[PDB]
């Protein structure tokens, strides 16, 4: 199928409590593969997947160099933004950046992104054409102009369409066993008598990868969206995901209800029924 590479950066100012916190993480699809944490002792980019571990010293030295330079840019940016919004030097503030690329099933470029947020709200983002910017407010229209005048989009376009996709391909080949796998969900239902005249039916999907999945309940084939309790898909910790959907069903109507499971790993979508 399609694949993605994404880097996520968070910088948090800590006035009077030292230098800002900086954390960087990199993912291929739903698998993390690198991290950097300003507060950790190593002060290096570190592997978080076994398939990147064997990359050489050139790789780690270079990623360390670059991630430190990212850190320093963000440190400057926190000051800049504080000034733009006329904010005091006492408070903690957050900048977040994400960039990366999507490829299709043929591993050819599909889309690039580069997005920036300040205190949890959009600040500026590269538009889909990778040539122009979306400034979320008046302050950001100024960054938009500056970055237009400095041809920043062109720098990013080159990376997103070239470098990014080339590296994503390399990671996919080397992490083939982990990354190019699908683990179809293992499914089961639980039944709990809420009372003498209702039971909760809970449909489980466990140990699946990638994270994208759809679980729905039907009654006599009619979708029960408004009556379904769904939880957010959650990591198991071993690189797979879990999710469940529940309905509360009346007396002896268990057979009317069906749970439907859609996942890239399944040859056909599953239709599950208590009996």
């Amino acid at each position: 199928g399609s694949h993605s590479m994404r880097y996520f950066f968070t910088s948090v100012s800590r006035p009077g409590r030292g230098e800002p916190r900086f954390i960087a993480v990199g993912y291929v699809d739903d698998t993390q593969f690198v991290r950097f944490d300003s507060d950790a002792a190593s002060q290096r980019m570190e592997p978080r997947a076994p398939w990147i571990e064997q990359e050489g010293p050139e790789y780690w030295d270079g990623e360390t160099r670059k991630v430190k330079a990212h850190s320093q840019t963000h440190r400057v940016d926190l000051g800049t933004l504080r000034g733009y919004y006329n904010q005091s030097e006492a408070g903690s503030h957050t900048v977040q950046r994400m960039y990366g690329c999507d490829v299709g099933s043929d591993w050819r470029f599909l889309r690039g992104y580069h997005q920036y947020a300040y205190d949890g709200k959009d600040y500026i983002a590269l538009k889909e054409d990778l040539r122009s910017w979306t400034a979320a407010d008046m302050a950001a229209q100024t960054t938009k102009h500056k970055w237009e005048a400095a041809h920043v989009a062109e720098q990013l376009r080159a990376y997103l369409e070239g470098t990014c996709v080339e590296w994503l391909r390399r990671y996919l080949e080397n992490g083939k066993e982990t990354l190019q796998r699908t683990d179809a969900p293992k499914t089961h239902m639980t039944h709990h008598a809420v009372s003498d005249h209702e039971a909760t039916l809970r449909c489980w999907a466990l140990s699946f990868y990638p994270a994208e999945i759809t679980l729905t309940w039907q009654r006599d084939g009619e979708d029960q969206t408004q009556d379904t309790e769904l939880v957010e898909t959650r990591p198991a910790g071993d690189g797979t995901f879990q999710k469940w959907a529940a309905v509360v069903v009346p007396s002896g109507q268990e057979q009317r209800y069906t749970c439907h499971v859609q996942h890239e790993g399944l040859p056909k979508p599953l239709t599950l029924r208590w009996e």
């Binding site: 880097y7 990199g26 790789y59 270079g62 990623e63 670059k66 991630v67 330079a69 990212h70 840019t73 400057v76 940016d77 800049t80 933004l81 733009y84 950046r97 960039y99 960054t143 500056k146 970055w147 400095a150 920043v152 720098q155 990013l156 990376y159 470098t163 590296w167």
Partner: peptide, 9 residues
Amino acid sequence: SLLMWITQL
């Protein structure tokens, strides 16, 4: 692999 640099605001 990361961008070679990111430009400041």
